Amino acid sequence: KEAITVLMTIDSYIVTGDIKGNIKFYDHTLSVVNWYSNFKLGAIRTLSFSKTIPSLPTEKSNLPTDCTLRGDLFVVRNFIIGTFDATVYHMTVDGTKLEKLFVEPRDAVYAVSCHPYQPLIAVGSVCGMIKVWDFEKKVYLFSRTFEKGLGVQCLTYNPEGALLGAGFTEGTVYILDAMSLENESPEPFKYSKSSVSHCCFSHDSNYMATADVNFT
Amino acid sequence: HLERNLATLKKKVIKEGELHRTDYVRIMQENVSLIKEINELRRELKLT
């Protein structure tokens, strides 16, 4: 029933992947060989298979039950999966782990703020994500997923670096905890009613200001 | 006679073609149904 859009064929298997998180391998008869499904994974747009042709252990091994009348050993190449929502994963060929890699902003992008005394940089999307990196380490670290469907664009540190702040296209402003990205104010401040367009702190931590696209 | 025979023969032939197409697509529908049932059965083993 569900929408398919991926199709590639490996070493006399066919492989097919779906809008909603089910990936299937077939033999040229269109016979059914065991699938991968229902992980936190969907709309798989990137499939790819290893350069390495698999060497074949069998003395101890983890292979899934194929659906033949008997149901035999089954050893693909290694192969790569990735979603619509920009989520990148590698599978151990033996299935024992579905391992995810970097995970990245879904859609459109807006500019990042640096901590003034620490090698930390914060990135945010339009959608649902603000995340911080140590740009020396090149290491993905702390990040908080934001409430659904709010657009977000503006980001700031206070001059101490102790505070982080972000601006949201639907009339919405948060102050953030430069550690946990807790919503510092028990609710955010939602006084305006359209997109932010700037935010800044004073030299005094006590004061912060924003512009909105209504010229207010 | 010769003409009327030829014409009626051609008409018969045309309907023969109609029947041939009809049965051909009927068997294609059969093949579809079998393919579905194969998939169902192969899946059904998985749980056991």
UniProtKB/Swiss-Prot annotation, chain A:
WD repeats lie at residues 1-28, 31-91, 95-135, 141-178, 188-216. It is found in: Cytoplasm, Cytoskeleton, Cilium axoneme; Cell projection, Cilium, Flagellum. Involved in spermatozoa motility. May also regulate cilium motility through its role in the assembly of the axonemal radial spokes. This is Cilia- and flagella-associated protein 251. It comes from Mus musculus. The lineage of its organism: Eukaryota, Metazoa, Chordata, Craniata, Vertebrata. The chain holds residues 651 to 866 of 1299 of the full protein.
Swiss-Prot record, chain B:
Predominanly expressed in testis, lung and skin. Weak expression in brain and kidney. It is found in: Cytoplasm, Cytoskeleton, Cilium axoneme. Signal peptide: none annotated. Residues 1-48 form a coiled coil. Belongs to the CFAP57 family. May form homodimers. Associates with components of the nexin-dynein regulatory complex (N-DRC) and the CFAP184:CFAP263 complex. Associates with components of the nexin-dynein regulatory complex (N-DRC), a key regulator of ciliary/flagellar motility, and might act as an inner dynein arm (IDA) hub or linkage. This is Cilia- and flagella-associated protein 57. It comes from Mus musculus (Mouse).
